[PDB]
Amino acid sequence: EDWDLVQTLGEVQLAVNRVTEEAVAVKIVDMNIKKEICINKMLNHENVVKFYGHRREIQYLFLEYCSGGELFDRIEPDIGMPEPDAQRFFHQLMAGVVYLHGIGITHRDIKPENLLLDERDNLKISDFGLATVFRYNNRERLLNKMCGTLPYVAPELLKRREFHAEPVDVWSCGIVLTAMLAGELPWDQPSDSCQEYSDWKEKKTYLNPWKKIDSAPLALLHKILVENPSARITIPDIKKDRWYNKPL
Numbered sequence: 001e002d003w004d005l006v007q008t009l010g011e012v013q014l015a016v017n018r019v020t021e022e023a024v025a026v027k028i029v030d031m032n033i034k035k036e037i038c039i040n041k042m043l044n045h046e047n048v049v050k051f052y053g054h055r056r057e058i059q060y061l062f063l064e065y066c067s068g069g070e071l072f073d074r075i076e077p078d079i080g081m082p083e084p085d086a087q088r089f090f091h092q093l094m095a096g097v098v099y100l101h102g103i104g105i106t107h108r109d110i111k112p113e114n115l116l117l118d119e120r121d122n123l124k125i126s127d128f129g130l131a132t133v134f135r136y137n138n139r140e141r142l143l144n145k146m147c148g149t150l151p152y153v154a155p156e157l158l159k160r161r162e163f164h165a166e167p168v169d170v171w172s173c174g175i176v177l178t179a180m181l182a183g184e185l186p187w188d189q190p191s192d193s194c195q196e197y198s199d200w201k202e203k204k205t206y207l208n209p210w211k212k213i214d215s216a217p218l219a220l221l222h223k224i225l226v227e228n229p230s231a232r233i234t235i236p237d238i239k240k241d242r243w244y245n246k247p248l
């Protein structure tokens with residue numbers, strides 16, 4: 001029943017049980033939050049941060065603790081990481097995302113800061129503060145609110161009033177794959193006023209970050225970072241991609 005607040009992790013603190021010594025993370029928010037909890041209550045997956053509970057004292061959320069830390073700290077700047085680790089993390093990221101979309105939830109802010117690692121380096125999707133329901137009673141609702149973080153965000157979100165939820169999460173996963181294999185983000189935002197994004201749209205892959213990416217992962221990135229959300233590859237199809245299925 002009693003937890004000691006060892007240290008601050010992010011506010012979020014690492015908590016250790018007085019009797020069992022089990023570790024958890026506690027999100028402390030003083031008064032979005034009601035929905036965060038609502039959504040967390042529906043989530044049960046090995047690639048999503050576990051929700052233990054909450055107490056309405058200022059509010060306390062009891063969330064799985066990931067001693068691995070965040071994925072960003074596994075990416076060497078300007079270099080990335082070994083391709084085999086990138087793939088494994090992407091496999092797990094896709095498992096996490098398939099699950100969420102499966103029960104009609106979109107994270108809306110997928111980035112390495114919200115991808116955590118446990119002790120076996122398992123990836124866990126984290127922070128459903130911006131998440132929302134996009135399918136309910138087998139009915140899809142298009143989104144119209146601008147959420148996320150500019151470098152990870154899909155283009156349609158900047159130029160369209162309404163958009164489907166799923167392809168937006170897929171784009172952001174591609175940007176994450178890019179960060180993992182090149183140690184840099186390709187652009188500040190997916191807009192035409194952005195030189196780096198114009199270049200990608202023109203297939204200038206001899207520039208960074210694309211120069212640093214092997215041809216197989218890059219062909220997949222060509223399928224994910226497609227401006228038209230309707231032409232953008234879908235997850236079931238990512239699951240069939242050559243690089244995705246390449247032994248490494």
Ligand SMILES: NC[C@H]1CN(c2c(-c3ccccc3)cnc3[nH]ncc23)CCO1
Nearest residue numbers: 009010012025063064065066069070113
């Ligand atoms: N990447 C920053 C993140 C780190 N963080 C967590 C961390 C954590 C702990 C140390 C370093 C980075 C992240 C581990 N498990 C967690 N579960 N829920 C949150 C969380 C809390 C939010 O800030």
